[PDB]
Structure formats: C-alpha cells, structure tokens
Ligand binder design. Sequence first.
Ligand code: SF4
Ligand code: SF4
Ligand code: SF4
Ligand code: SF4
Ligand code: SF4
Ligand code: SF4
Ligand code: FES
Ligand SMILES: [Ca+2]
Ligand SMILES: [Cl-]
Lengths: 294, 907, 150, 149
Amino acid sequence: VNVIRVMLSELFRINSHLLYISTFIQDVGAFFAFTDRQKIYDLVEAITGFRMHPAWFRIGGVAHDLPRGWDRLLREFLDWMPKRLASYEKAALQNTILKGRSQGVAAYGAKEALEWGTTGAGLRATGIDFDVRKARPYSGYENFDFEIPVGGGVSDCYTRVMLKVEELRQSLRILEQCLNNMPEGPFKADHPLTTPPPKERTLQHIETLITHFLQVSWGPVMPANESFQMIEATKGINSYYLTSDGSTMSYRTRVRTPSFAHLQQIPAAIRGSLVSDLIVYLGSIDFVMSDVDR
Amino acid sequence: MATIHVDGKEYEVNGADNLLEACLSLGLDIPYFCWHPALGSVGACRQCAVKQYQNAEDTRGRLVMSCMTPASDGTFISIDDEEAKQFRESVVEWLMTNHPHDCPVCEEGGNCHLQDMTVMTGHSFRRYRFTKRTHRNQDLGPFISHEMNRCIACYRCVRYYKDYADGTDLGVYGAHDNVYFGRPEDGTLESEFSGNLVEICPTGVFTDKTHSERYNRKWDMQFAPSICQQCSIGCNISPGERYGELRRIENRYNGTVNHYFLCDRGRFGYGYVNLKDRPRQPVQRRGDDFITLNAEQAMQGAADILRQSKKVIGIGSPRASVESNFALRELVGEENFYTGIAHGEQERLQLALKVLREGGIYTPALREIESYDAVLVLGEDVTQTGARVALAVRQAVKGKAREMAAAQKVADWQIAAILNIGQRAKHPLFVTNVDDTRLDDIAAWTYRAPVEDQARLGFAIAHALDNSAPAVDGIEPELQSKIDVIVQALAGAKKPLIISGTNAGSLEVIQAAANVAKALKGRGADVGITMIARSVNSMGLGIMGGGSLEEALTELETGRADAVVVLENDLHRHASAIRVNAALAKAPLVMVVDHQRTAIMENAHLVLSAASFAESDGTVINNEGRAQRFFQVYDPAYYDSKTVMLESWRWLHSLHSTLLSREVDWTQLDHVIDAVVAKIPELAGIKDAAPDATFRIRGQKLAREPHRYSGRTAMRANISVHEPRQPQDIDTMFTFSMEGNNQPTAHRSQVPFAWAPGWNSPQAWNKFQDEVGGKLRFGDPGVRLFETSENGLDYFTSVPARFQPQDGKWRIAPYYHLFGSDELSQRAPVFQSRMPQPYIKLNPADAAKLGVNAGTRVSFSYDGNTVTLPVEIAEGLTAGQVGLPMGMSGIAPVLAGAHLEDLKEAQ
Amino acid sequence: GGAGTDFLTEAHLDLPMEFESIGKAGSRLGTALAMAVDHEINMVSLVRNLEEFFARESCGWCTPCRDGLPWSVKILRALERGEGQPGDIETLEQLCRFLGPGKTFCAHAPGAVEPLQSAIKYFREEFEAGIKQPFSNTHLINGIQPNLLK
Amino acid sequence: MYPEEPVYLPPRYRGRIVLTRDPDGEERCVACNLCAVACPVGCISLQKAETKDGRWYPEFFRINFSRCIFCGLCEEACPTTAIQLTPDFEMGEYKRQDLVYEKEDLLISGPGKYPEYNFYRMAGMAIDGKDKGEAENEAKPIDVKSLLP
Ligand code: SF4
Ligand code: SF4
Ligand code: SF4
Ligand code: SF4
Ligand code: SF4
Ligand code: SF4
Ligand code: FES
Ligand SMILES: [Ca+2]
Ligand SMILES: [Cl-]
C-alpha cells in the first residue's frame, strides 16, 4: 500500500508540474503538456477508473488491487518522459526570453519565506532544504533513493520553475523504483477498522459482511483523539488536522493548504514592481484557488 | 456506595449492582447479550467477560462475567486485559460460526446488537471453514416474523416472554447446538406484550411484520418523541416515517412510565395513519357536489356562515389534544362547548378524577405500580384496556420472591436464584370482572359477577377494613368467607394498591374502590389508587369539562343551535346513530374536523382535513394526570404539495380569527398552550410538559433524522429534480432535518431516537440514562398536573342492590378486546385478523332456555334496530346478562349497562 | 478416571491413585475407574469420539461449550480424514484454554477439553499427520482481485 | 477522433451506473439501502419490496445523475454486486428532470462486470429455488424432535 500510494502520488506530482511548467513557459517564454499528461491519466484511469479525482485511497489501503497490465503501461511512460523532459528543461535553460522575463522577478530570501509560511519550491529556492518526504518521511518514502532540488538563496520566478523541472526528474526516479520493486502482498491492511473490508471476504463471510454493512452505513467509529499528517504536495506542504469525538464523522477537519499562504506573501513580494511582473509572479506560484479557499 | 478499580481508574458505584450494570452506567463499554436491564443476569452467552484481580498486587487474575459479579468495594477488574479482549472476540467468533449471511435481507441491519458487538469486539476475519447449522422457521401470527437461523441462544426472548410477561406459548426446545426458540406449534403469539420481543431479541429472529411490508433502515427514518394514542396509559413512543408514511412505532424509554416495554395495540395499531381514504384537503359539500377548497377559502367561507349563525355549538373528543379541545371551546364559547361523551361516561370520568385529585390517596406512575405488595382490581379488565398496567401488576405480584430472596442475602440482579427461592409464592392479587380475565392465572381469586355485585364486594371489603364505612346487606356466608381473605390480605399489606376505572360502566364500582382505598389510608397504610380511563386525553377532557353529547344533540334538536363544529369524534361511539344522524340533519351548518373518514362526514357541509398525532403537536393527559407533549413526526405536504392537513388547534384558532377579524391566524403551538394555562388554571402544568420552540442545545435545535439519513437529493426527484426547501418548524424545538442535536449527553428530556457511536441497536438507550435501567439522565419527560390532596373524600353511602335477572330485559355485560375495542386501532388493516369475529356471549343456562347453542344466530332489538350475532357460550357470565364486544364497529361502548329486549333465535 | 480426565502415559503408572498425586501428574483422579489405550488405537479418532460425546451432551446454555465443542469435533474429523489445514491444532489448543475452568457456566466443557489438551501434549505427531491440505475458507470471486495476505 | 473514432475506456472506468442481474436472470438487487447510505451526495432512492417466495427487490430505484459525482462508493458498498459503474460517459440531456433515472433505465439484461455471483446462494433466507440448508457451506435443518442423540 505504501508503494502503491507513493506511485499514484508521484504520477499526479508529475501531472501537476507538467501543466504548471507548460503554462509558465507558454506565457512568460515561448513543452506540450496535453500529450504527456494524457499518458499519465491513462495509467491512473486504468488503476482508479477515474482521471482527475481518483478517490482510490482508503482507510487502510486502496479501493482495489493494481489492475493486471499496470506494469506495461508504467514502463511505457517511464520510456517516453525521459526524452520529453529533456525538451522541457532545454527550453527553460535556453529560452532567453523566459530567463530575461523571469530571472530577478518577485525575488525573496529565506527570511521572507519563513515569515509568510512559504513552503515547497519557494522555500527551497531560498536555500532552505525542507521537504516533508525527507524531513518527516511518510508512506515508506525513506525506502526510495531521490534528491531534493534546492536553490541558492534567492526565490525568483525562474528559480521556482527550475526546481519544479528538477523535481520531475526525481519523481520519475521514484516511479522507476516503484515499477521494479512493487512489493507482493495485501493492498488493504489487516485491521478491524480497514474501510471497506476486502470485498471477496465481504461477499462470502458473515463477520466481514457485518463489518462492511456498518462501515458503509453509520460509518467507521474512530475513538476520540486528535491526529495530524503533513505531506509534500504538488504546490507545497498540505496537512489535515483531524479531531474525533469518538463518532463516525469528524468533529473538526482543518485542511492547511500551501496556496493560501503563497497568496498572502504576494503584497510583500510584488510591491514596487510592475503589473507585468505580478502576472509572471502569479504564474511562478504553482497555485489553484480551490486550495486557497477550500 | 462501593469503590471499584476498572483498568486502574477508580470509580464510585452501587455495591448492590453487578459490574456490567455498574461499568455500563459509568460509560465504560463491555459487550453483552444475555443480560437485560429488566430481565436480570443469567450468565449464558459469557460475552461480558472481564479479568478480575484479588488485590492491587495481583498480576495474574481470572476471567469472570461482569453481569454475574457483584460491584463490591475493593474490586479490581480490567476490561482491556488482552486475555479478556481475546475471549470476548472468541465468543463472537463462536456465535458467527453458524450465523447466516443474510445482513442485506434482514430487518435488524443497522439496528442489530449482534452487528454492533461483532464490530466492538473487532472480529472481521473468519477462520471457520465448516458447515453452518440451519433451522426451519414458524408462523408466529400477523405481527412477529420468525428467522431462527439468525439466533445466538442468549435466551432473552424466553426469559422476557415467560419470566417477565408470564406468557405460555414461547419456549426453548432441543439440546446442545440445536436449541430452538419459538412456539410449541405454528400459531399467533397470545401475549398482549409479544411485540416487545422485536426489541428484546439482540438479533433478527423476531422482527416486526407490520414494518417488513414497507421496510426502511433505521438511518432513513424521521423520528419524533410522541405519546401513544391507543389507550389512557400514555406510553412514550418513537414513531418513524419514510416517504410520507408512518413505517414503525418503537418504544421511547420513560423511566417513570413504560420504561422499556409497550403493548401490541400501541406497537402494531398505527396503520390508520397510513389509510389512503383519510381527508388531505378541505372539502365543501354543495348539494351533491364536492369542492376541494384551500385553507384560506375554507376559513373565509366557514366564518361567513358562522358569523350569521344564531348559536354555534362545538363537540370535542377524548381523542383530541388539550390544545385542540381548548381551541374549539374558545371558538364556540365555554357555554356552547360540549364534551363528545355520554352523560354516564362523563359522570364516571369526573368521579375518577375527583378520587385522584381530591381523594388524599397517591396515584402511582406505571413503573411505581411494580412496588405495591397487594392489588385489588374492581371491574377493570386492565389487560384489554390498560395492558401496560397489567404487565406492571404482574411484576408487583412477583415481589414476594424478591422479598424472600433478599432475606437470604441474594443480589437483586440474580434472577435465577430469586425465582428458585420464590417457587409459586406471589403477592396477593384479587380481580373482579363480569367474566374471565387474562390476570386470572396470577390472581388469588377472581369474582365474576354483574357490575353491581362487583361494587357491593368493594363496599363490603371497605366495611370490614373500617366499620365506619357503609355496610352491605345480602352478602351470602360463602362470599363473606372469600371477602375475609381479601380483607386480611389488604390489611396485612404494607403498600396496598386499589385499581378501578370507567370501563366497567358503573359509577358504584369507582365509589366502592374509593371507599376501600380510604379505609386502608385510615388504617395508616401506603395505599395507592389507580383509575383506568378509555382514551389518550379522557382525563384532559374531564379536567376541561363541558356539556354532554346528549345535551349538545338536544340543542340541535330543539333547533336552538344551527351550527355544530365536531372535533375528531364519530359521535356514534358515544350516542345512538339514529339520534346523532337525525340531529346533524336539522343543522344548517355541520363542520367536521377529523384526520379519519367517519360516517358523520357524509352529511357534513364542510370537512377540515385535520392532522393525526404523526402530523401534529399537542399535549395529552394520561390516567395518572401526567401531561405529556407529542411532537410532529413529518410534514404531510413534503411529497404531495396539494396536501393541506393542519393541526386541529391551528384550524380552529384561524377560524376564530377569521370570524372576529375576517383575517386568518395560524398561530404557534406555544401561544395556544399559553392561552390554556391562562384560561384553565387546572391545566397549567401543560406549560412545563416540554420546553418551548426557543429551546436549543448550545444553539442547536433537536434533530428528528439520524446523521446518516440518505436520499436527500433523490427522494422527491420524481416530482421535481429541484430539491424542495427543508420543511420549517415554528411550533416545536425539533428540526425536520438532521441539522440538529441528538447527543446522549444533551441537557434535555425529549429523545426522538436512541443512537450512540458503536451502539446502533435499542441498547443505545443505556447511553441516554443516568444508570442503565434507571431514568433519563436529565429527568424523564412529563409533569403530573395534580399532587395528593391534604384531605380526602367522605365514604360513598350508596351501596347498590344485588343484580336480579328480568325476563325480557338482558343486561349488556362489557367485554373489551385489546384488538378491536379502540376506534383508530380497529381502522388499522393489520388488526383485522387479530380482531375477534362478531359474537354475543350467553350463560349456558340462558342459551338452553332460549333453545340456542354455540353458533346459533340470535336476533335482538336495541335502538329500534334488529341485530343478528352468532351465540357464544360463556359459563362465567352470570344469568340475565348478555356479552357484547364493546367498541367493535356497531357495538358502541355506551351499550355497557343497557338492556336488550326481544332476544330470540334468528330466522 | 473418566472420559473427562486428562490422558497420562506409562511413566505415570507408578503414581498412587490419590486426588493430589494424579493432580500433580497433570490430570484428575475422577472416578478412579481407569481406561487403558493400546498402541493399535489412534489418539485423534479416540479424542474425536470423546468430543462427539461431550459436544452432543452439552445443554446449550453458554456459547463456549455450545458452539466451541462442535467446532473441535469438525477439526478432529477433518484431521482423521486427512483433510486437516494449517492452523487446526492452534484452534484446538485455543479452545482448550478458552473452554477451561471459569470461562464456561459449568464444568462439562472444562472437563471435555482435558482429554483433548493431553492428547495434543503427548501425541501431537498423530494430530499433525492430519494436516495435509492448504488452508482455504474463501472461493475465488471473478471480477474481484483478492487481498493476498502474506 | 470522437465521435467517429471511439475512446478506449479501461474496464474499471467509473461511468453510467446500471443495475445488474444474477446468472439465473433474476435482479441481483435485494433493496438493502447500503449503496444509498454510502452515497456521499444522496442521489440514490429505493424502496424494499418482497416477492411471494420471500425474495427482496427494489419496488422503485431512482438515481439523480444531475447530482451523481461517479465516485463508485455505492458499487463498493453492494453485498450483491447489483449496482455497478459501467464504462460509459455519454449521458448529456436537454432537461435536468430526464437525468433522474428509474429501474427501467438502470436494470440491464446481464451480470455486468461481475460474471458469476449470487448473494442468494450465500444467504440463509429461503427463496423460490433455495430452501433451508441449500445455500453454500450450509447444513440441512435438524428437527428438535429427531431421535438421533
Ligand atoms: S441478525 Fe444482525 S448480524 Fe444477523 S443477519 Fe440480521 S442484521 Fe446481520
Ligand atoms: S431468538 Fe433472539 S432472544 Fe431468543 S435466544 Fe435467539 S437471539 Fe436470543
Ligand atoms: S398500554 Fe395504552 S398507551 Fe401503552 S402502548 Fe398499550 S395502548 Fe398505548
Ligand atoms: S458448560 Fe455446562 S452450562 Fe455451559 S453449555 Fe455445557 S453443559 Fe451447558
Ligand atoms: S443496489 Fe446493492 S447496495 Fe443498493 S439496495 Fe440494491 S443490493 Fe443493496
Ligand atoms: S457514484 Fe457516487 S455520487 Fe453517484 S450514486 Fe454512487 S455513491 Fe452516489
Ligand atoms: S451478558 Fe454476561 S454472560 Fe451474557
Ligand atoms: Ca406542527
Ligand atoms: Cl351478593
């Protein structure tokens, strides 16, 4: 489950970065995401049955097991991106228009990143090496060999985009280890509170049928406690502060999203610049208003 | 009382309790099945296992059963001990070995204690690979369904049906793992309290067939705290609705009234609410043309005729609420308001009230009845009129065993021991009726005699207990000997209980009971008096008062009254149909406000579509004088927008406003309640019966729907894909939604339904009570309107003369049926089979004299009408008396005490 | 001394027939009417017979004895038919501990597991020969990939 | 391209929801209301009904596809493999009221993605065809009046 949940996450991490890098380059400079993004969606669709909103992960595992043939699709994608990525960086590296319009725009250092809660490429561009996947390992990420792209002290529009390109290469590396080291065993935990329980047993065993009935009806009863898990998302550190009062529904679901903080730093980072600079900055910040407003 | 140590934490508990009861009452969760807060502890399923240590230094304790272990001081137990957890999971696994895979198709799914415990024990993996035992099911009648495959052998049904309800048709058969729980043969369960099995059984072996027809899961039910309307006991119920139809009636725990048990009439007699012939919109009769009007049009037009009416009289009903009856009284004037009851019935009801309100003797609550040590029932067939009181009398009779066991220092929860120590020993019980009663099995003596002779016995017992009491003449030496046994039993009792009522049809039987109770009070005894009425708000109408139906008819007959507004009353159950129909035909305007299609509606000029208890909110007063409020369960116009079924008080209040201001006023319930408390000081407690509509829990309204209610965006999609607006409630503190509060710790007393995380079964009431089996944590709902008076009434000196058979005349003796005597319950379709076939009962000798045998149809004339009925032979019935099923359509309850004339073989 | 007593070996034949001596040996004196088992008798089939009796003589009051003993009989019958699956002996041992004194309502089951626990203690090899098949309580539902527990 | 060139949808594609039938041709639905409660939008409404034999079935089954998010929580919740999301994406309509499908627009004539599963062969509740003791891993009823000890 750890490796499956990492694999799906890195597929979507690439998908989001591709779109972000493509859009920035299209507007600021002069990298077709559609084609590469479709290949990812095809694997995700084969595994989840859906594209943008998989809703596959479950409390204790993933809704189903990997579909037979997933390895073939993944290998094909891991043999197509290598070259496509080479084209993505070359552009940014040699697009003088991009470099000229992006370098030294909306620049901020470590102090500004820390005071405004900036996380992700922005924080790393300031030179602070803080990636939750390495700082606070989760989902068995500690079992993967990858490097965190870090900047040199200045978080400008160009440095932010360049780190996102270097992240794609590291994500492809994790996806290769997932493909060659996919463990054999359960896709759902063997815990009384795994929801829903393995369907094959639910369809043939009364004890598992009873557990399923209640978990899909009144809901899974979570004992009273407070939990918190922060993860390195596609746009920065995203966390879920959950509070249970011992019921089948949350008493409080706090979702800390990186985009909300990145939009509050804009006034301090763009003051004194021109509107043209603001539009480039807005692009360099990988952000979606759904993450900001929730 | 005692200090226990559970999992290290220290707790103060009652040493007289068992660890299960104690820990459950502390909020600690221990799985269980065989134990029930009312059936005691037996130690069968072995599920409540807890590790017990001898001291604080013991590290190797023993697995004991919390239900069979005293909560003694210095007790060290652990529920989270690994061995205890493993054993508790193993017990569930053993029960799952032979358990059917029928969750999706069983009616306990989502309300099953077994499902709740499987999950609580954390057993989700099956290791058993062998075959599962199967059992063939049986027919148990029209109310309960059988599915023995889903059994776990906890023995709860047999312990409740036979050791608590004293039934004789349920039993345990077979041995080892082939134990079977059911009837000795296929047939209808005969216990009037058989329905409680559906909530007692922790699985789905016993289910409710009345619901199975239109079954829905508990999470999809809209529930509201309501009071049962089938008799005068006033049991708290939780009616549930889905798709605009009352689906099921469940028990609402009232630690002061019905606690955990209802009776079959209230649990399965609600189908009348789902009848499709019920009025739904206001309709006006123009000659032979019927016009459906709207609320506004109906009010304006009616007020126009009423404004030009010489005298508008109003007839109320014991079925209607206090607010509804009061609204009619204000609309027509107290001088023109008449209780739709016969003169005699009103006299008896008022006499019963005077005894309870001015007799100086305490009237016990339903649960308090189980604590008296001697009971005398004078003329009241409780089992068929106030069934829940009969169940309470049964528990009271079982007190001797409990007293005997306490002398041997046996714990109160050890039922098995108490029963063995007791044997056939019981507290004295004496019942009087015109014939056999269902309480004859536990009664020391049953006096079968005419109502007059039954009363003479009461006056006699009173004279023997106090010579100052009026003496009776003509008591034969044989009876005197029997009277002495009753006198010594009541005299020897420390807490005697006298029970009478208005169902006997005699004022003397109520006066006799008052004399006996006064006699025992004079001898310094904790005497109790209980009076059984006939309907949900009989006592409420009695307190309000008014003219009789006969007087109301006379007004219409002299022509002095031109308009009659009848409220929820058929009038044919209280007066002759010929007289009522003729009187209603001489009235220029006849308006009927009822929620059921009655006969008088046929010739009514206007019929207002009133709401039933399910679609209305109001206050009813029980036999003990407790004012209890019922709340609307669902909005009748949610699915069908055309429906205009409004509460009777709202209809009448708006009409009164349109009559005085030509403007409609649909007021809130609280305003009407405030009017009643101001105008009638006697009905003042009704204000404290329940909080107002402004009551909130931390800002939240109380909720009616469970938090997992489904279909919100699809239930009405057929009518319109556009979801309707949540029906709004301005009358109560309940929301017609899930956006409210139903916490087990909410500082309230009105609980719509019982649900707690991990407890989806009726066992969830345990989390809403101060102590399991006790009272609601923040008090039980309901207020007694009157307290025991400082002074009592003088002895009644009117002893009747002995009954004498008269050639030609045949005294009508009152036979009541739990299934058939009530008006609304008889309308329910599922009751048709349970209801008795029409009959007349005759003394064997009288039948021989009339040369008729069992089955012979006999013709007789009452109100100038020849009726034919099959003859049944009743040996207990005295000669000169005929038996008729009171309340059964045709036989009006008023016939009690009347006389038949030309009784002869038909054809 | 009885079908409900724990089996002892030839080494225990030199022990006096007293309540304390047999108890320390690991059994109970019982009725003092002993029974001798020869080498030509299979312990699994013998205990299966004992359990079939103890299981059907149950009155059905408490779950441990009513639903636990019948399980053991099925496992023992499978073992004697060579259809035993891994985990059978462990279930038998768990039953012996969870059907012991204090757990059941009376001592019918506590004494019913006495012969079973002893036979597994001194003659486990006989119970092991029974397990010859792989464990499986689930069939393969087409369309649903199974959770492969390792 | 579309619509001339059809689109390959994977077998697990979460699209138009259909009600399926058992290998015996009977509807696999038992009207337990698990899919409905498990539904996060509340776009499923059904009512239980029973055949004279005792077989549970949906008297009516309504799915508002105007609110449906095609998440598959309902298909994951069936204990009977009746409700299934099929690989179909073309459900555009002119009036929203026509996005409210009934059993006539949901019950197909086959088993769907699950080819051979009958809950009624696992249940212990007797129906026409399966009597007490005729289900899987189920022993035949033993009468309490049997003479065998
Ligand atoms: S009794 Fe409870 S556990 Fe058994 S099939 Fe019915 S709902 Fe499921
Ligand atoms: S029928 Fe119900 S109450 Fe009776 S033994 Fe079975 S599970 Fe217990
Ligand atoms: S005793 Fe009376 S109030 Fe109680 S449930 Fe029966 S009919 Fe209803
Ligand atoms: S151990 Fe005793 S009480 Fe329990 S089932 Fe066996 S014989 Fe009955
Ligand atoms: S579709 Fe499945 S989950 Fe929904 S009611 Fe039918 S059987 Fe139950
Ligand atoms: S796919 Fe999701 S939204 Fe649609 S009916 Fe099923 S559970 Fe509800
Ligand atoms: S609840 Fe205690 S033994 Fe069953
Ligand atoms: Ca209302
Ligand atoms: Cl007499």
